[PDB]
Write a structure and sequence with these properties.
Spindle assembly abnormal 4, lipopolysaccharide transport protein A fold, 15-stranded antiparallel β-sheet, mainly beta
């Protein structure tokens, strides 16, 4: 039932009875499970990454050894997530940073720097050299 085939190079093709196909490189540093449900799972040993692909939401999920976790959406929005709670989100073409003073923090393509604090105040640094402070 569970069919595992080892090719001449050393690579492996394994067929599961459920419908899932799994592939292993000749050096065994790259593993790929083709779940049916149309999901894809990729493991890169040399890069220490594990990628989960959801075909139901078209979302890629990459996890790193240091704790870095990246989510990729079809809209173009990318979300970085460190273990220390710090979160970065990438829009076209903006970027919001979150650390747990500053509630949020935004950097734009203009070079514009927006800082939002917990009190509600806002600091806006414009690329033309202007500084902008918003108060209650």
């Amino acid at each position: 039932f569970k069919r595992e085939i080892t090719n001449a190079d050393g690579s492996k093709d394994i067929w599961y009875p459920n419908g899932n196909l799994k592939k292993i490189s000749a050096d065994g540093m790259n593993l790929r499970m083709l779940y049916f449900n149309k999901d894809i799972k990729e493991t890169n040993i040399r890069e220490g990454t594990v990628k989960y692909y959801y075909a139901e939401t078209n979302t890629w999920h990459t996890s790193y050894l240091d704790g870095l976790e990246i989510l990729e959406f079809p809209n173009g929005q990318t979300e970085h997530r460190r273990k220390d709670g710090t979160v970065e989100i990438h829009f076209p073409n903006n970027s919001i940073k979150i650390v747990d003073e500053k509630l949020e923090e935004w950097r734009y393509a203009d070079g514009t720097h927006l800082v939002q604090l917990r009190n509600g105040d806002k600091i806006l640094n414009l690329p033309n050299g202007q500084k902008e402070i918003h108060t209650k």
